[model samples]
Target: ARGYIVTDRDPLRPEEGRRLVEDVARLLQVPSSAFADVEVLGPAVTFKVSANVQNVTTEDVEKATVDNKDKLEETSGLKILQTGVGSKS
Candidate 1:
């Protein structure tokens, strides 16, 4: 598992989470199968971008978050508080 982008603002909604799932995949140039469980759980935009982390590198995920932070905020109206990419053995 890998990748987490945390944020908050207006009440969190399911659609925004879905949007994160889709956009992250796009920004990272990955496919839908990239995430074993793409879900939303937060008072804000707490999305679980649980990637398989096998097909993509950790750097790829981190860079995607860094690269897209501004665009995501601009379009989604959610400030990305923090982000990370790691894997569990």
Candidate 2:
């Protein structure tokens, strides 16, 4: 395997930006992982993305949560007290 890591954000070129995840997967030569470890907490109203429905539901929120959980656990050597997801509760 190779060692590599890259991080970035964009303001325009949505059509291109929309493909960010796919591009990253290609670069890493891995199928898109079910786990997401990226956060878009704030400081930016929007990204150079096409604004797809799936992006909002599937990746954006879940990915940010997953990334956040990892950080919290790493920093404290303990996971967040309790975190779960459900709807219509």
Candidate 3:
């Protein structure tokens, strides 16, 4: 979502939500490639990322993900899983 906000508020336009999606994918690094997924929402530019791998369930991944929230936020300047699909249980 860092790329979402970063791109949303600049020379880049908000209508370019898809661009934000692409940007975030390359911009953020969460520690492992096994868990690399990002989804972008509407004009509000909301989004979420998942660290779930083939062996990890959402529940187990959430625990590890939550622990890294601060680092993720700091690294991206955007909160992890702030909104969109993954925000819901």
Candidate 4:
């Protein structure tokens, strides 16, 4: 288990950001309740991933995120900013 937040490098609307967070959690198999924090910047939202998941690899996670970006953008009209996994807190 580890922690990482995916967010745009700019700023997005509150509702849009929340939607992104929900999508991320679902895609990463992170529990909905493990979302402890959400920080919104100018055009982005940072969501805290809980340290209670398993079977996650950085390579797989990155590929999954990028692979799904196109679909999400096509559907939601939103692009993925950045994603990473680190620190177990």
Name the best candidate (by lDDT).
1
**Global lDDT for candidate 3?**
0.39
- lDDT tens per residue, model 3, 1-89: 22123222333333354443433343333333433343334323533344433444334334443555565456544444432223323
Q: Per-candidate RMSD vs. true structure?
A: 3.9, 12.7, 7.7, 4.3
Stretches of model 3 off by over 4 angstroms after superposition: 1-38, 43-54, 81-89
| Residue ranges of candidate 1 with Cα displaced over 4 Å | 43-54, 86-89
In order, the Cα lDDT scores of the candidates are 0.62, 0.33, 0.39, 0.59
TM-scores for the candidates: 0.65, 0.23, 0.35, 0.60
Residue-level lDDT of model 1, residues 13-85, one tens digit each, is: 7678667656767776677566555545573333333446446654566677788888877776677777776
Error of 4 at 12 (Å): 0.8
Predicted structure 4: clash tally: 6
Comparing 2 with 3 on TM-score, the higher-scoring candidate is 3
TM-score of 1: 0.65
Please tell me which model should have the higher lDDT, number 3 or number 4.
4
TM-score of 3: 0.35
